Short mmCIF file of C-alpha atoms in Angstrom, two decimals:
data_model
loop_
_atom_site.label_atom_id
_atom_site.label_comp_id
_atom_site.label_asym_id
_atom_site.label_seq_id
_atom_site.Cartn_x
_atom_site.Cartn_y
_atom_site.Cartn_z
CA UNK H 150 0.00 0.00 0.00
CA UNK H 151 2.03 2.98 1.27
CA UNK H 152 5.50 2.40 -0.21
CA UNK H 153 7.44 4.81 2.01
CA UNK H 154 10.79 3.42 3.09
CA UNK H 155 13.67 2.46 0.84
CA UNK H 156 15.93 -0.41 1.80
CA UNK H 157 19.68 0.11 2.11
CA UNK H 158 22.66 -1.82 3.52
CA UNK H 159 25.35 0.58 4.82
CA UNK H 160 23.61 3.85 5.86
CA UNK H 161 25.38 7.21 5.98
CA UNK H 162 24.90 9.88 8.60
CA UNK H 163 24.20 13.55 8.21
CA UNK H 164 27.59 14.04 9.85
CA UNK H 165 31.14 12.77 9.45
CA UNK H 166 34.77 13.42 10.20
CA UNK H 167 36.88 15.65 7.99
CA UNK H 168 40.58 15.70 8.69
CA UNK H 169 43.27 17.83 7.08
CA UNK H 170 46.77 16.34 7.06
CA UNK H 171 49.82 18.48 7.60
CA UNK H 172 51.62 16.82 4.67
CA UNK H 173 55.04 17.29 6.27
CA UNK H 174 54.88 14.02 8.13
CA UNK H 175 52.32 11.20 7.61
CA UNK H 176 54.44 9.20 5.11
CA UNK H 177 51.38 8.28 3.02
CA UNK H 178 52.50 4.72 3.85
CA UNK H 179 48.81 4.02 4.59
CA UNK H 180 49.68 2.25 7.87
CA UNK H 181 49.48 -1.55 7.72
CA UNK H 182 48.13 -3.15 10.89
CA UNK H 183 47.06 -6.83 11.15
CA UNK H 184 44.54 -8.18 8.64
CA UNK H 185 41.70 -9.20 10.94
CA UNK H 186 42.06 -5.93 12.76
CA UNK H 187 43.06 -4.05 9.80
CA UNK H 188 39.42 -4.45 9.02
CA UNK H 189 38.07 -3.58 12.32
CA UNK H 190 40.37 -0.69 13.10
CA UNK H 191 40.87 -0.43 9.45
CA UNK H 192 39.58 3.08 8.40
CA UNK H 193 39.76 5.01 11.65
CA UNK H 194 43.44 4.70 11.70
CA UNK H 195 43.92 5.31 7.99
CA UNK H 196 41.90 8.49 8.44
CA UNK H 197 43.82 9.50 11.58
CA UNK H 198 47.27 9.29 10.04
CA UNK O 1186 42.77 33.72 -0.69
CA UNK O 1187 43.49 37.07 0.92
CA UNK O 1188 40.21 38.93 1.33
CA UNK O 1189 41.58 42.29 0.22
CA UNK O 1190 40.36 44.87 2.73
CA UNK O 1191 39.26 47.08 -0.17
CA UNK O 1192 36.08 45.07 0.00
CA UNK O 1193 36.01 43.28 3.32
CA UNK O 1194 35.54 46.93 4.19
CA UNK O 1195 33.00 47.95 1.50
CA UNK O 1196 31.03 45.34 -0.42
CA UNK O 1197 27.24 44.78 -0.41
CA UNK O 1198 25.66 44.15 2.99
CA UNK O 1199 25.02 40.58 1.86
CA UNK O 1200 28.06 39.02 0.12
CA UNK O 1201 29.39 36.04 2.02
CA UNK O 1202 33.21 36.10 1.65
CA UNK O 1203 35.18 33.11 2.72
CA UNK O 1204 38.16 34.48 4.58
CA UNK O 1205 40.57 31.79 5.88
CA UNK O 1206 42.82 31.54 9.00
CA UNK O 1207 46.04 29.50 9.25
CA UNK O 1208 46.46 26.69 11.81
CA UNK O 1209 50.05 27.07 12.96
CA UNK O 1210 50.82 24.37 15.49
CA UNK O 1211 52.44 21.87 13.17
CA UNK O 1212 54.72 24.64 11.97
CA UNK O 1213 58.44 23.79 11.58
CA UNK O 1214 60.81 25.50 14.07
CA UNK O 1215 63.51 27.23 11.89
CA UNK O 1216 66.91 25.55 12.05
CA UNK O 1217 68.61 26.58 15.30
CA UNK O 1218 71.50 28.15 13.37
CA UNK O 1219 70.50 29.57 9.95
CA UNK O 1220 70.46 33.39 9.62
CA UNK O 1221 67.11 35.28 10.10
CA UNK O 1222 64.79 36.64 7.44
CA UNK O 1223 63.15 40.15 7.88
CA UNK O 1224 59.48 40.86 7.25
CA UNK O 1225 57.08 40.19 10.02
CA UNK O 1226 53.99 38.66 8.48
CA UNK O 1227 50.71 39.72 9.91
CA UNK O 1228 47.02 39.58 9.58
CA UNK O 1229 44.73 42.57 9.62
CA UNK O 1230 41.40 40.85 10.21
CA UNK O 1231 40.51 38.64 13.16
CA UNK O 1232 37.28 36.76 13.66
CA UNK O 1233 35.32 38.46 16.39
CA UNK O 1234 34.00 35.22 17.90
CA UNK O 1235 35.45 31.78 18.79
CA UNK O 1236 35.75 29.96 15.49
CA UNK O 1237 36.66 26.33 14.94
CA UNK O 1238 33.71 24.54 16.48
CA UNK O 1239 33.81 21.57 14.18
CA UNK O 1240 37.39 21.09 15.41
CA UNK O 1241 36.90 18.28 17.84
CA UNK O 1242 40.33 16.71 17.54
CA UNK O 1243 43.45 18.91 17.11
CA UNK O 1244 47.10 18.17 16.33
CA UNK O 1245 47.54 14.46 15.90
CA UNK O 1246 51.30 14.30 16.23
CA UNK O 1247 53.50 13.81 19.28
CA UNK O 1248 55.94 16.47 20.42
CA UNK O 1249 59.26 15.21 21.85
CA UNK O 1250 59.49 17.14 25.13
CA UNK O 1251 56.27 17.72 27.04
CA UNK O 1252 53.71 14.92 26.67
CA UNK O 1253 50.75 16.99 25.43
CA UNK O 1254 51.77 19.08 22.40
CA UNK O 1255 50.98 22.75 23.01
CA UNK O 1256 47.17 22.80 23.19
CA UNK O 1257 45.72 19.76 21.41
CA UNK O 1258 42.08 18.66 21.74
CA UNK O 1259 41.62 14.84 21.77
CA UNK O 1260 37.96 13.66 21.15
CA UNK O 1261 35.39 13.99 23.94
CA UNK O 1262 33.93 11.00 25.78
CA UNK O 1263 30.89 11.19 23.55
CA UNK O 1264 32.23 10.94 20.09
CA UNK O 1265 32.38 7.32 21.31
CA UNK O 1266 29.87 6.70 24.12
CA UNK O 1267 27.53 4.47 22.14
CA UNK O 1268 25.05 3.96 24.94
CA UNK O 1269 22.13 1.58 24.54
CA UNK O 1270 18.83 1.97 22.70
CA UNK O 1271 15.86 2.87 24.90
CA UNK O 1272 12.86 0.58 24.62
CA UNK O 1273 11.10 3.53 22.99
CA UNK O 1274 13.81 3.84 20.37
CA UNK O 1275 15.64 6.92 21.65
CA UNK O 1276 19.30 5.92 21.81
CA UNK O 1277 20.57 7.16 25.13
CA UNK O 1278 24.16 7.36 26.53
CA UNK O 1279 25.50 4.65 28.80
CA UNK O 1280 24.35 5.13 32.45
CA UNK O 1281 26.47 6.83 35.12
CA UNK O 1282 26.67 4.68 38.27
CA UNK O 1283 22.93 3.91 38.30
CA UNK O 1284 21.56 7.24 37.12
CA UNK K 940 41.61 -17.91 47.21
CA UNK K 941 40.79 -20.31 44.37
CA UNK K 942 41.64 -23.71 42.94
CA UNK K 943 38.99 -23.30 40.24
CA UNK K 944 38.37 -26.93 39.44
CA UNK K 945 36.43 -29.11 37.14
CA UNK K 946 34.72 -31.51 39.64
CA UNK K 947 33.94 -34.24 37.07
CA UNK K 948 30.19 -34.47 37.73
CA UNK K 949 30.30 -38.24 38.37
CA UNK K 950 31.90 -37.47 41.73
CA UNK K 951 28.54 -36.15 42.91
CA UNK K 952 25.92 -38.57 41.59
CA UNK K 953 25.82 -42.19 42.72
CA UNK K 954 23.51 -43.50 39.94
CA UNK K 955 26.01 -43.04 37.10
CA UNK K 956 23.63 -44.25 34.37
CA UNK K 957 23.14 -40.68 33.10
CA UNK K 958 26.58 -39.24 33.78
CA UNK K 959 28.84 -39.64 30.74
CA UNK K 960 31.94 -38.27 28.99
CA UNK K 961 34.18 -36.18 31.34
CA UNK K 962 36.27 -33.04 32.48
CA UNK K 963 38.14 -33.81 29.36
CA UNK K 964 35.42 -31.83 27.44
CA UNK K 965 35.86 -28.52 29.37
CA UNK K 966 39.48 -28.85 28.41
CA UNK K 967 38.44 -28.84 24.76
CA UNK K 968 35.63 -26.44 24.62
CA UNK K 969 37.76 -24.09 26.60
CA UNK K 970 39.82 -23.97 23.37
CA UNK K 971 37.01 -23.55 20.87
CA UNK K 972 36.84 -19.82 19.97
CA UNK K 973 33.31 -18.97 21.19
CA UNK K 974 31.12 -19.43 18.11
CA UNK K 975 27.92 -17.73 16.99
CA UNK K 976 24.79 -19.55 15.86
CA UNK K 977 25.59 -18.65 12.23
CA UNK K 978 29.13 -19.89 12.89
CA UNK K 979 27.97 -23.32 14.02
CA UNK K 980 25.65 -23.75 11.11
CA UNK K 981 28.85 -23.64 9.19
CA UNK K 982 30.99 -25.91 11.38
CA UNK K 983 28.23 -28.53 11.19
CA UNK K 984 27.46 -28.02 7.51
CA UNK K 985 31.11 -28.61 6.72
CA UNK K 986 31.56 -31.67 8.93
CA UNK K 987 28.55 -33.35 7.52
CA UNK K 988 30.08 -32.53 4.15
CA UNK M 1088 65.59 -25.74 26.95
CA UNK M 1089 64.43 -22.28 27.93
CA UNK M 1090 67.20 -19.96 29.12
CA UNK M 1091 66.06 -18.91 32.63
CA UNK M 1092 66.52 -15.21 33.58
CA UNK M 1093 69.42 -14.05 35.87
CA UNK M 1094 69.17 -12.19 39.18
CA UNK M 1095 69.30 -8.57 38.01
CA UNK M 1096 66.49 -8.45 35.47
CA UNK M 1097 63.30 -6.69 36.39
CA UNK M 1098 59.72 -7.59 35.42
CA UNK M 1099 58.15 -5.09 33.25
CA UNK M 1100 54.70 -5.77 31.69
CA UNK M 1101 54.99 -4.32 28.26
CA UNK M 1102 52.54 -1.58 27.21
CA UNK M 1103 52.31 1.41 24.87
CA UNK M 1104 52.71 3.81 27.75
CA UNK M 1105 56.50 3.19 28.04
CA UNK M 1106 58.15 3.83 24.73
CA UNK M 1107 57.70 7.52 24.05
CA UNK M 1108 59.62 9.26 21.26
CA UNK M 1109 61.91 11.95 22.58
CA UNK M 1110 64.86 14.02 21.46
CA UNK M 1111 68.38 13.35 22.66
CA UNK M 1112 71.55 14.56 20.87
CA UNK M 1113 69.58 15.65 17.82
CA UNK M 1114 67.80 12.61 16.35
CA UNK M 1115 64.55 11.34 17.90
CA UNK M 1116 65.76 8.29 19.82
CA UNK M 1117 62.69 6.21 20.80
CA UNK M 1118 63.35 6.37 24.54
CA UNK M 1119 62.12 3.64 26.82
CA UNK M 1120 61.25 4.90 30.29
CA UNK M 1121 61.54 2.00 32.78
CA UNK M 1122 58.59 2.25 35.26
CA UNK M 1123 60.43 1.48 38.55
CA UNK M 1124 62.24 4.82 38.36
CA UNK M 1125 61.59 7.24 35.49
CA UNK M 1126 64.82 7.36 33.47
CA UNK M 1127 64.32 7.59 29.71
CA UNK M 1128 67.18 5.76 27.98
CA UNK M 1129 67.27 6.85 24.36
CA UNK M 1130 69.99 4.65 22.75
CA UNK M 1131 69.16 0.88 22.85
CA UNK M 1132 72.57 0.14 24.26
CA UNK M 1133 72.81 0.64 27.99
CA UNK M 1134 69.16 0.34 29.06
CA UNK M 1135 68.82 -1.27 32.34
CA UNK M 1136 68.39 -5.07 32.57
CA UNK M 1137 64.72 -5.34 31.84
CA UNK M 1138 62.70 -8.48 31.38
CA UNK M 1139 60.13 -7.48 28.78
CA UNK M 1140 56.87 -9.20 28.80
CA UNK M 1141 54.61 -8.87 25.75
CA UNK M 1142 50.99 -9.84 25.94
CA UNK M 1143 49.64 -7.42 23.34
CA UNK M 1144 51.97 -7.43 20.34
CA UNK M 1145 49.13 -6.14 18.17
CA UNK M 1146 49.77 -2.42 18.45
CA UNK M 1147 53.53 -2.20 17.86
CA UNK M 1148 54.88 0.21 15.29
CA UNK M 1149 57.24 -1.59 12.93
CA UNK M 1150 59.98 0.31 14.78
CA UNK M 1151 59.28 0.77 18.47
CA UNK M 1152 59.03 -3.01 18.51
CA UNK M 1153 62.16 -3.51 16.45
CA UNK M 1154 64.05 -1.19 18.77
CA UNK M 1155 62.86 -3.24 21.65
CA UNK M 1156 64.13 -6.35 19.80
CA UNK M 1157 67.23 -4.35 19.00
CA UNK M 1158 67.66 -3.63 22.70
CA UNK M 1159 67.23 -7.29 23.26
CA UNK M 1160 70.43 -7.90 21.47
CA UNK M 1161 72.82 -5.41 23.03
CA UNK M 1162 71.10 -5.22 26.39
CA UNK M 1163 70.24 -8.84 27.06
CA UNK M 1164 66.67 -7.62 27.62
CA UNK M 1165 64.61 -10.80 27.78
CA UNK M 1166 61.35 -10.23 25.93
CA UNK M 1167 58.70 -12.74 26.32
CA UNK M 1168 56.16 -12.77 23.70
CA UNK M 1169 53.36 -14.56 25.48
CA UNK M 1170 50.95 -14.46 22.62
CA UNK M 1171 52.08 -16.39 19.57
CA UNK M 1172 51.04 -20.09 19.24
CA UNK M 1173 53.54 -21.67 16.84
CA UNK M 1174 54.34 -25.31 16.32
CA UNK M 1175 57.84 -26.72 16.99
CA UNK M 1176 59.72 -29.44 15.12
CA UNK M 1177 62.92 -30.41 16.88
CA UNK M 1178 64.54 -31.63 13.67
CA UNK M 1179 67.97 -33.36 13.71
CA UNK M 1180 71.30 -31.53 13.20
CA UNK M 1181 72.26 -33.31 10.00
CA UNK M 1182 69.84 -31.24 7.88
CA UNK M 1183 69.33 -28.28 10.21
CA UNK M 1184 66.84 -25.50 9.52
CA UNK M 1185 65.16 -23.98 6.49
CA UNK M 1186 61.92 -22.09 7.14
CA UNK M 1187 63.61 -18.92 8.33
CA UNK M 1188 61.65 -16.78 10.74
CA UNK M 1189 63.33 -13.44 10.93
CA UNK M 1190 62.90 -11.19 13.97
CA UNK M 1191 60.86 -8.66 12.04
CA UNK M 1192 58.12 -11.30 11.50
CA UNK M 1193 57.96 -12.87 14.88
CA UNK M 1194 56.96 -9.31 15.91
CA UNK M 1195 54.43 -8.29 13.25
CA UNK M 1196 52.69 -11.61 12.61
CA UNK M 1197 48.78 -11.54 12.66
CA UNK M 1198 47.33 -13.04 15.88
CA UNK M 1199 46.05 -16.01 13.91
CA UNK M 1200 48.85 -17.38 11.72
CA UNK M 1201 50.39 -20.20 13.64
CA UNK M 1202 53.84 -20.38 12.13
CA UNK M 1203 56.06 -23.39 12.11
CA UNK M 1204 59.42 -22.88 13.89
CA UNK M 1205 62.05 -25.57 14.22
CA UNK M 1206 64.48 -26.13 17.04
CA UNK M 1207 67.77 -28.06 16.79
CA UNK M 1208 68.23 -31.68 17.88
CA UNK M 1209 71.79 -30.90 18.97
CA UNK M 1210 72.56 -34.12 20.87
CA UNK M 1211 73.52 -36.26 17.85
CA UNK M 1212 76.28 -33.95 16.61
CA UNK M 1213 79.70 -35.64 16.53
CA UNK M 1214 82.64 -34.04 18.38
CA UNK M 1215 84.55 -31.60 16.18
CA UNK M 1216 88.01 -32.74 15.19
CA UNK M 1217 91.22 -32.12 17.16
CA UNK M 1218 92.63 -30.19 14.19
CA UNK M 1219 89.51 -28.34 13.04
CA UNK M 1220 90.52 -24.69 12.37
CA UNK M 1221 89.35 -22.83 15.53
CA UNK M 1222 86.17 -20.85 15.07
CA UNK M 1223 86.53 -17.12 15.85
CA UNK M 1224 83.08 -15.55 16.28
CA UNK M 1225 80.28 -17.01 18.38
CA UNK M 1226 76.93 -18.22 17.18
CA UNK M 1227 73.98 -16.19 18.35
CA UNK M 1228 70.57 -17.64 18.97
CA UNK M 1229 67.44 -15.68 19.76
CA UNK M 1230 64.15 -17.59 19.79
CA UNK M 1231 63.44 -19.87 22.73
CA UNK M 1232 60.43 -21.88 23.64
CA UNK M 1233 58.75 -20.63 26.78
CA UNK M 1234 57.18 -24.02 27.68
CA UNK M 1235 58.67 -27.54 27.39
CA UNK J 199 71.38 -47.56 15.21
CA UNK J 200 71.51 -43.83 14.94
CA UNK J 201 67.94 -42.58 14.96
CA UNK J 202 67.88 -39.26 16.94
CA UNK J 203 64.41 -38.14 18.07
CA UNK J 204 61.58 -40.48 17.90
CA UNK J 205 58.02 -39.18 17.80
CA UNK J 206 54.65 -40.56 18.46
CA UNK J 207 52.71 -38.87 15.64
CA UNK J 208 49.02 -39.38 14.96
CA UNK J 209 49.71 -41.15 11.65
CA UNK J 210 48.09 -40.10 8.38
CA UNK J 211 47.82 -43.80 7.53
CA UNK J 212 44.62 -43.82 9.51
CA UNK J 213 43.85 -40.12 9.57
CA UNK J 214 44.23 -39.87 5.81
CA UNK J 215 43.41 -36.61 4.04
CA UNK J 216 40.22 -38.43 3.05
CA UNK J 217 38.76 -36.86 6.21
CA UNK J 218 40.60 -33.60 6.07
CA UNK J 219 42.95 -33.75 9.04
CA UNK J 220 45.99 -33.16 6.87
CA UNK J 221 48.68 -33.96 9.43
CA UNK J 222 52.33 -33.51 8.37
CA UNK J 223 53.06 -30.93 11.10
CA UNK J 224 52.57 -32.50 14.55
CA UNK J 225 49.33 -30.57 14.67
CA UNK J 226 46.28 -32.22 13.11
CA UNK J 227 45.08 -29.03 11.36
CA UNK J 228 41.72 -29.70 9.66
CA UNK J 229 40.81 -26.88 7.29
CA UNK J 230 37.73 -24.89 6.37
CA UNK J 231 35.80 -26.21 9.35
CA UNK J 232 35.08 -23.26 11.63
CA UNK J 233 35.99 -20.22 9.53
CA UNK J 234 35.11 -16.54 10.09
CA UNK J 235 31.95 -16.39 7.94
CA UNK J 236 32.10 -13.47 5.58
CA UNK J 237 35.78 -13.38 4.68
CA UNK J 238 38.38 -15.93 3.51
CA UNK J 239 40.02 -18.34 5.97
CA UNK J 240 43.47 -16.94 6.71
CA UNK J 241 46.35 -18.98 5.26
CA UNK J 242 47.69 -21.28 7.99
CA UNK J 243 45.40 -20.04 10.74
CA UNK J 244 45.60 -21.07 14.39
CA UNK J 245 41.99 -22.39 14.79
CA UNK J 246 42.57 -24.61 11.80
CA UNK J 247 44.09 -26.69 14.59
CA UNK R 248 19.58 29.78 5.19
CA UNK R 249 17.73 28.41 2.21
CA UNK R 250 20.48 25.57 2.32
CA UNK R 251 19.67 24.97 6.10
CA UNK R 252 15.98 24.14 5.59
CA UNK R 253 17.05 22.29 2.52
CA UNK R 254 19.41 20.14 4.47
CA UNK R 255 16.42 19.98 6.86
CA UNK R 256 13.61 19.36 4.32
CA UNK R 257 15.92 16.56 3.16
CA UNK R 258 15.98 15.02 6.66
CA UNK R 259 12.20 15.34 6.56
CA UNK R 260 11.68 12.85 3.79
CA UNK R 261 14.81 10.81 4.32
CA UNK R 262 13.13 7.53 5.15
CA UNK R 263 15.18 4.39 4.80
CA UNK R 264 14.97 1.00 6.41
CA UNK R 265 18.36 -0.44 7.04
CA UNK R 266 18.71 -4.08 6.31
CA UNK R 267 21.94 -5.56 7.71
CA UNK R 268 24.34 -5.62 4.76
CA UNK R 269 27.38 -7.83 4.12
CA UNK R 270 28.62 -8.46 7.70
CA UNK R 271 31.66 -10.61 8.57
CA UNK R 272 32.42 -12.15 11.99
CA UNK R 273 36.06 -11.99 13.05
CA UNK R 274 37.31 -15.36 14.25
CA UNK R 275 37.57 -14.14 17.83
CA UNK R 276 41.05 -15.50 18.75
CA UNK R 277 42.54 -13.22 16.11
CA UNK R 278 41.97 -9.69 17.35
CA UNK R 279 43.88 -7.85 20.03
CA UNK R 280 41.71 -8.04 23.19
CA UNK R 281 41.51 -4.33 23.33
CA UNK R 282 39.43 -4.73 20.12
CA UNK R 283 37.50 -7.69 21.54
CA UNK R 284 36.06 -6.31 24.69
CA UNK R 285 34.98 -3.65 22.20
CA UNK R 286 33.50 -6.07 19.61
CA UNK R 287 30.35 -8.14 19.80
CA UNK R 288 29.91 -11.18 17.57
CA UNK R 289 29.26 -10.05 14.00
CA UNK R 290 29.78 -6.45 12.97
CA UNK R 291 29.10 -4.66 9.67
CA UNK R 292 31.65 -5.38 7.02
CA UNK R 293 31.73 -1.64 6.44
CA UNK R 294 32.64 0.07 9.70
CA UNK R 295 33.27 3.80 9.53
CA UNK R 296 35.78 6.07 11.25
CA UNK R 297 35.61 6.54 15.00
CA UNK R 298 38.09 7.77 17.59
CA UNK R 299 38.12 4.77 19.93
CA UNK R 300 38.66 2.11 17.35
CA UNK R 301 42.18 3.35 17.81
CA UNK R 302 43.16 2.97 21.43
CA UNK R 303 46.40 1.13 22.23
CA UNK R 304 46.53 1.08 18.44
CA UNK R 305 47.99 4.42 17.31
CA UNK R 306 51.47 6.02 17.59
CA UNK R 307 50.49 9.39 19.06
CA UNK R 308 51.04 8.60 22.75
CA UNK R 309 49.11 11.47 24.20
CA UNK R 310 45.52 11.24 23.01
CA UNK R 311 46.09 7.52 23.03
CA UNK R 312 46.81 7.65 26.76
CA UNK R 313 43.73 9.77 27.36
CA UNK R 314 41.47 7.66 25.07
CA UNK R 315 42.67 4.46 26.52
CA UNK R 316 41.89 6.36 29.84
CA UNK R 317 38.66 8.10 28.66
CA UNK R 318 37.15 4.66 28.12
CA UNK R 319 38.19 3.79 31.68
CA UNK R 320 35.39 6.06 32.88
CA UNK R 321 32.43 4.31 34.68
CA UNK R 322 30.13 5.92 32.14
CA UNK R 323 31.25 5.75 28.51
CA UNK R 324 31.79 2.28 27.03
CA UNK R 325 32.30 1.79 23.29
CA UNK R 326 30.65 -1.10 21.43
CA UNK R 327 30.23 -2.49 17.91
CA UNK R 328 28.02 -4.81 15.85
CA UNK R 329 25.06 -7.03 16.81
CA UNK R 330 24.09 -5.75 20.24
CA UNK R 331 20.60 -7.18 20.74
CA UNK R 332 18.22 -9.50 18.94
CA UNK R 333 14.51 -10.16 19.31
CA UNK R 334 13.13 -12.93 17.09
CA UNK R 335 9.52 -13.64 16.11
CA UNK R 336 7.55 -16.17 18.08
CA UNK R 337 5.53 -18.55 15.97
CA UNK R 338 8.29 -19.24 13.43
CA UNK R 339 11.31 -18.89 15.76
CA UNK R 340 13.76 -17.27 13.28
CA UNK R 341 15.47 -13.94 13.98
CA UNK R 342 13.71 -10.65 13.03
CA UNK R 343 15.21 -7.19 13.74
CA UNK R 344 18.84 -7.17 15.03
CA UNK R 345 20.05 -4.07 16.88
CA UNK R 346 23.46 -3.26 15.47
CA UNK C 1186 86.11 6.35 3.93
CA UNK C 1187 85.42 3.77 6.63
CA UNK C 1188 88.72 2.17 7.62
CA UNK C 1189 87.34 -1.37 7.77
CA UNK C 1190 88.59 -2.91 11.00
CA UNK C 1191 89.66 -6.00 9.05
CA UNK C 1192 92.84 -4.05 8.46
CA UNK C 1193 92.95 -1.22 10.94
CA UNK C 1194 93.44 -4.34 13.03
CA UNK C 1195 95.95 -6.24 10.83
CA UNK C 1196 97.88 -4.47 8.09
CA UNK C 1197 101.67 -3.96 7.85
CA UNK C 1198 103.30 -2.18 10.79
CA UNK C 1199 103.92 0.76 8.47
CA UNK C 1200 100.84 1.63 6.34
CA UNK C 1201 99.53 5.09 7.10
CA UNK C 1202 95.71 4.91 6.82
CA UNK C 1203 93.75 8.10 6.81
CA UNK C 1204 90.80 7.47 9.07
CA UNK C 1205 88.40 10.45 9.38
CA UNK C 1206 86.19 11.79 12.25
CA UNK C 1207 82.97 13.79 11.81
CA UNK C 1208 82.58 17.32 13.24
CA UNK C 1209 79.00 17.38 14.49
CA UNK C 1210 78.26 20.79 15.93
CA UNK C 1211 76.61 22.32 12.91
CA UNK C 1212 74.32 19.32 12.78
CA UNK C 1213 70.59 19.99 12.17
CA UNK C 1214 68.26 19.26 15.13
CA UNK C 1215 65.54 16.88 13.73
CA UNK C 1216 62.14 18.52 13.35
CA UNK C 1217 60.48 18.70 16.78
CA UNK C 1218 57.57 16.56 15.55
CA UNK C 1219 58.53 14.03 12.84
CA UNK C 1220 58.57 10.34 13.86
CA UNK C 1221 61.93 8.73 14.92
CA UNK C 1222 64.21 6.51 12.88
CA UNK C 1223 65.87 3.37 14.49
CA UNK C 1224 69.54 2.48 14.11
CA UNK C 1225 71.97 4.07 16.43
CA UNK C 1226 75.04 4.96 14.41
CA UNK C 1227 78.34 4.46 16.07
CA UNK C 1228 82.03 4.46 15.67
CA UNK C 1229 84.32 1.67 16.72
CA UNK C 1230 87.66 3.48 16.62
CA UNK C 1231 88.58 6.58 18.60
CA UNK C 1232 91.81 8.51 18.36
CA UNK C 1233 93.81 7.87 21.49
CA UNK C 1234 95.14 11.43 21.75
CA UNK C 1235 93.70 14.96 21.40
#
């Protein structure tokens, strides 16, 4: 009847983190942690270089 | 950028110019020996109210001398408090010793 | 002050016609990495295979 | 055979809190602080007889950790990595070794991977000759098995 | 006369790969039995054992 | 301002029903325990950024020390993935999962 | 250079090798922030007289 709701898998928020790197350090080496945890920690760390 | 004061001073009462401050804290301390340079660099327009509100984390680097680099934020105990989810559906912060 | 021990059930019941196996299992399950229901469906599905 | 630890050595539970990164004689030596009595010791060599215990091993920077391993060498620091789960071999001297674990890997291996190591049989080695050209420099061994 | 270390393995003769348990290393080491649903094993994992 | 209501009118008719997407389940004994106390069974195979998922897991010593500490508070306690399930009666399968 | 000790140790009693010290005093103090490096650099031969 009232089709009001659209299915989605990974939802985004109306807010997020925006960092600005002082490209002086950082290395760009995209830090390599474990594999299992690369995925859990995964992005947060990549973002917070 | 460089909002030229010509206009910051006299431009329509609307116009929304995007001036832009610098964030010197990760600035490199000039080599302890090298000879000086000679123009002081200044800024002739300061925001009249506390800016940077979205800045919730500042200076992610670690000074070598003094543990806490000169004034650095470090996320508040909320940007990670993931409480529960009220029965009614209003997600509410973890309790506080039985509150 | 603990000596956390297994107490193999049989040393409690006299009618050992129900009691079976042993403390040997806690030894083993202690190793299994706690699984989820979805996880077991898999362990079982692949054994049966 | 697990080399026991001497009298001097102190018990230090490893943690991220210790190894800061400070400046000393230009350069940013990765000083280790030694809990008992705050005394940052930049250069690996000369730390102070610490028995390093690792439980974590999942948050090491490919260098703080190496430095610690580095300090193992020159300082006889004994670091016990308590979280690894490998499988021994104890394989006879006549065909000794092959799969070469290098110190960098012991340190950065994912928590899962259960790597094969292989200790020496040693006992069945025949006496060296009475005219064998003397050997000058000693053999160094690092990995030990913490349990029998 | 001259055998050095003698070990009491588990013997693949009976635990042949026909059931998985691919011995070789002293460890039995099954295989894709209880994996981490949603990813891809993890070459030479610990729980394989 | 027109952009503010707009962002707002957007929130007004921004109706979506999430439906648990591709979610893995770390093998447990393969995650530093700092991560584990934090984890909870499955967890979306698409986690986003979050200062906490980096305690005892980032160079920067200060910040790390405080975060590792910040979590020590009686209140705040981080979490992640499958936190609570209710599952239909009648046909005993699992309905809505609280992630 | 790098007088290899092989020889500083065992070379004719004459040979006049030209070893060479560094004069660190005008050395640059590593940027107060940048992350550390990890090999201490040393020297295994010191002149015995001023």
